[model samples]
Target chain A: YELTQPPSVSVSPGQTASITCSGDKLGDKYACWYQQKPGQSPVLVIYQDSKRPSGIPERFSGSNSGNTATLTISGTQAMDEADYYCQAWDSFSTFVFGTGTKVTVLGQPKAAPSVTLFPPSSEELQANKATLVCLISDFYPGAVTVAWKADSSPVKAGVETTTPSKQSNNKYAASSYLSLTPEQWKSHRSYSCQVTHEGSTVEKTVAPT
Target chain B: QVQLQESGPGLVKSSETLSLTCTVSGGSMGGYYWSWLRQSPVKGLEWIGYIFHTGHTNYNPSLESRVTVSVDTSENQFSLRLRSVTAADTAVYYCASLPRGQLVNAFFDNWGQGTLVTVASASTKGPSVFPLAPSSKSTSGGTAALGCLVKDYFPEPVTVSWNSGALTSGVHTFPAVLQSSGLYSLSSVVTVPSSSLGTQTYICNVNHKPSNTKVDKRVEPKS
Candidate 1:
């Protein structure tokens, strides 16, 4: 799990937001607590300590030892943004769950969204093909990720990504495509685009117009 | 709000043994875990192991030399084998869920409508049968455990029935987990007494006696 904070966390109204989840063993009291709210269905809100689940709302909290675990939330709200995960049952019995923490509400908006690059044009490069789009726009709660590079190496082929979309003002857009052929795209001319949102990390570059 | 339908084999033959099957209706093979996610247009999401309702599994050591998750083996089944395939294990496979009991929900709630497996060997696409479309939920008070998860189908029988506003009863079924692409699945629950508000209508019919294909869902109680 190893999420030592900073994947995104902002609290408001008297603040308290915390997010830690060191790994290893993670035994003791079976730890559990989820939040996920997008299409919905993932709201456990605590288990085995500080118990809170009868409709959860004691400021949504939790804690555990033996490997580290915690999920606090003092006054924070704006629906708390959602995306908290942290489960256990390990010791090898597995039953895992991690990779979480993303709750921004206290004056949200950090801005890192805005990248553009639309390669591959020219009567279709006369059928030799060439693709590389990467138009990420304004962003917000919608979470993001997109990566592909070729000169610096790290292009997993035809790479295509998308799934942040949620505009109409709530802001957030995504795009990522990268096919090649224009003679291997001019013998592999640099091509890059890496977006990561929330923790921020945007980059853009286009070639082979 | 808990469904998972995955029936396998669009082609498999590098070493062979890719199989898949996830037929759960109204869900509950023991109130927890039963996953098997995979998504490779190039390594996206890959968990590949989960089976706990007695079959006990936990693979994904990179494949564990060929994973093999199973539960029931012949009832509301939940299976997914993986054995030697090479084309990098071509995927699209999905059979999600970790949702807890009594409609506790999420962490992978309802998802099973993915089927694309091809390791190679003449791969063109064959073996398949639909039928999914069944997943219900009902939870509110004084004893209520309504579940239904009768996922994906194939050759080999299938059946699950129940009704409450009319008659049919004796619910509580399971024991037909066999999908290595042979296809079939099961899981059924029925507990009532939250003051029987007319037993709050409930139905979970899924019969694919080899293609008659009939999916059903009827869960009520959440006013």
Candidate 2:
């Protein structure tokens, strides 16, 4: 018992979008659709394939045909962009969710990020360990990559990166940390922080004193 | 309101059995479903199985052959036993509760903090690619956050990408950390505008050089 949906869908504001969910054991089972935004729990928009929960906008609706279920959003707005999922339960009492569809809005603005790499403090280095901090700030559409390299090669051990967080000015910010023993820091000639956004890569390098 | 806590040994040898118990407090163990779930860097999250108080049990098809879940209402606890374990079975295991008669719309309400279990092998193995998943967490002030976990790989230089570079503005990938098994685990996170969240898809790509393995996992909002 599995559910499948399109990977993505694109539409402009003021248009309508219909997402289809296909799976077995769906025709008899009530299909439920949920709209999920990052950092928030999913909100059920339609249950039993066509019934809207209380307070959900009338623009959202659902229906089913045979093994497929459709969630229709009429008069879509910019804020309507999100990940949509359809779920159903099988006779075995197991439930399945669709692969999910990402709804993208055309004419939306995307911003690249500014990246900076800071060396470990002298006091910390003196204590036999070092921490390198890579800062990424002021980005939009919120998906970027941050990588660390020691002596011109990627470093994986002792690294932790935070999820992007929203800043006060509506931009996004994130940080990546590189942990190193003083010996490893001194052994490597240089450490670098690389960030890629919008197909462009920004990098900064530093050396041990 | 019931509280759950998991108790078990932290390590188990290869091909041996792993067991853990979930103690229930603040409420009786009747009229609900008890479940076992696990998360690892390689597999992200998994639903092992669940058992009703009356001994009716269900297991995930993937683990049914090697998994057992049982309940003890008299002791206010439930237990999980996984047999013939391997490094792939090493994970942070959690116990949770599900409502009765809510199978169609069931959600885990109470959960334990989870216990880390490492399946130690007598001998070492070769390289492998560790893939993971992105869990969505949305917050106030119009932004959504997501994370991906990559674990259990050796010789650690791995590259992380989001949406194949289509959405690259707000992604953050952490460095790999050495595990007790001597493998490495990594994580990456991405953020998006709350307003544009509906129209976004993020695929986490992990590229490991040694094994020449590339794993791509998708991130969906918490639904």
Candidate 3:
């Protein structure tokens, strides 16, 4: 059996927020809740449908109604911002974790990314191979789609893109590589690297010199 | 909320044919391409090929001579057959779906849990599953984004799902990139409303085919 929950939730400091979990035959099982932070492991908070684990703050609570289980946060604080999951012992004789919900105390800001393209060097082209590089940087919410095009046609093979990594400056950075043979590079009038971030797309193109 | 489960034989002898079928549930077979992939400790993960719902097929050039991938709309399923298999072909085989018109590098969004097929092999090594807990990556406007990084696993064709079986819907899943260390890395992201009515929890589930390793990484909004 699988449990379902909202993908995310939002609340202000001192506000109250609740997340729900629904699944089959949930009423017969004991429901539990957990708190998890990014890059860290989950820590149990509530178990037995409203019983707090030792040392858990009273502000975090859990409850169940019929087939639905819930985790409620009272007087939400900045520290309360984290994902919460409700787990229940199901008829399958296993513990099932809910889809989970993201609790943000205050809103987070978003930033668009800057894109730049670098052409292959003459020496590399002379060696019968060429590599084009696209650098995407300074984006908030580190997600982007990258595509390559030769002239006006899409290019798929031999393209490698990196997952956006957090930068020291609190932004995100990523790179994409487009491999082409020297002959293929010369045959095209222009090659373009396009990046889409935050619903906006930026394109950078280069032509053979 | 499409789900896929692989059903077939767990064992095949050397030099004999290997056959497996993937049954898709809660969804139809239209507008998507069904694909088959396999993973082993030695060969890592290799794409056997894909087939359209119309029965049109394509196989990996390396195994084009011996591989056949077919689809049956009536059964809501697809099948994979490899002739004259040897121990080298021993691996965990997975069936998945790629969006229509997507590149080969596109995400095989929905995936079967995978079935281990032994071709008289001595043993099989399960994947070392690593789930990078979902984190607040970027939040802008009314929405915030969460990212999950999955890496260091064999049989590169891994599947990442959000919120149970909402595979790739309203999400971005990058292709599994082969790393220098011979393992593969995958990344997925989902954007959610920042001002929703209640709190939210996001779970990232990664399923690696070999050894049937499954990992769940969870995260919440920033404090």
Candidate 4:
């Protein structure tokens, strides 16, 4: 029941919120997170909190922040969802749960915007080839889809993308790549890369071509 | 090494009778009395009653008038019946047992896994009876049935009855089957009035034959 953080907290929309629990003093190691919706039994959210159980999104993250432990939800979603609680097992063979956190999604967006084309933020020319890379961070749940757009349409060929495995704290870090001829890179046209996740989307454009 | 488990729906509607069965494993029903007890969220444990393989029983007086404890020795299980229940009956119910003659003092030392039952109003006729009553109610008016169910080892029988200031008149029923599992069940019912509900008390006394000491429960209805 002891928390390393204050009993309550408030965070701005689109900002990362981190809460920590300290069980080391209590000689505790196993940490868990639970979600209880009104009358239902509490559901296990994060056990050992740092590792996401299968089917859990990448937006929820857990890690030890020095002597205190932390659970962070990046870019909260409407259903990111119910009250969150943290628990830990102690050396004394007892279990404890932290007071819960309620998530409230703010600033509702109207109709989702359609896909738009833009240039990559940074382009590099190496040897005889040009490379366009897109990097996006602060996205929750890590399972987002990224695509390369050429002109007003999709780039169907010569595209390479890599999405890293989720880290200890539910944050996702991913990258996408495209290789094209120097002529294609120097055309002064706009190339775009879009990141799509649970309910939100973000796109980056650069004037590489 | 014997283990028993009680499983059923966790929620039951009001006025609807709640039923639950307990399954025994790893041990024979041989020399034991199967018992039931319930614990409410904030209340202490309340004994419902126990049955033996021979169809004999010992019930808690407060519940004797409305409770029925039955045994299905063939299935190695037993069941509990609480009729016309209300929200106050919501609790975690458990099944248990003790060595023959050991329960005369009415201590339940062993128990089964518990099942929770909550009473909310439903459209049905409701459960058959309300077995447990507050300690102050009169046993002379409304028709209430309660009693214990016991089995095996009965040269000397136990006694169960309804009482306020004095005992009320009613027929007591005993178990129908006698088996080596030592499983049995019995029940008694009486009718009393709402006016006498708060001025009387009910008692269920178990007299351990050979030894003359008796264990009892004095129940007064809620005022």
lDDT of 2 by residue, A13-65 (tens): 88899899998746777787878664333566887778776879999999988
**Residue ranges of candidate 3 with Cα displaced over 4 Å:** A12-14, A23-29, A36-41, A51-58, A64-68, A75-83, A90-92, A102-106, A116-129, A138-175, A185-209, B1-223
The candidate that achieves the highest TM-score relative to the unseen native structure: 2
Full candidate order by lDDT, most accurate first: 2, 3, 1, 4
Model 4: how far residue A198 lies from native, Å: 34
Off by over 4 Å in 1: A1-33, A37-44, A48-73, A77-80, A83-106, A110-112, A121-127, A130-132, A137-173, A176-209, B1-69, B72-223
| Candidate number with the higher lDDT (1 or 2) | 2
- Top-DockQ structure, candidate number: 2
How well is each residue in A141-202 modelled by candidate 1, as lDDT tens digits?
Answer: 66788888877877886765555655434466665657678887777667788888867687
TM-score of chain A of 1: 0.32
What lDDT does each candidate get? 0.61, 0.72, 0.70, 0.54
Error of 1 at A98 (Å): 21
DockQ of each: 0.01, 0.05, 0.02, 0.00
**Under CAPRI classification, how is model 1 graded?**
incorrect
- In angstroms, how far off is A35's CA in candidate 4? 29
Comparing candidate 1 with candidate 4, which one achieves the higher lDDT? 1
Writing each residue's lDDT as its tens digit, candidate 3 over B1-223 gives: 6777777435566788888888988879987888887755666445678889888887776687899887889989898889899978887787877668734223345557677676763333343322222223343536544546554465445677887775354465555555554555555666566543136667878776544667777745432
- Writing each residue's lDDT as its tens digit, candidate 2 over B113-200 gives 6766767754322233222222234445465555455545655356788888887777766545565556665556666776555567
Deviating ranges (above 4 Å) for candidate 2: A11-17, A33-61, A73-85, A92-94, A104-108, A112-116, A127-131, A141-209, B1-31, B35-47, B72-77, B87-99, B102-223
The positional error of residue A23 in candidate 1, measured at the CA in angstroms, is 36
Model 1 chain A poorest ten-residue lDDT run: A87-96
Minimal lDDT window, size 10, model 3 chain A: A88-97
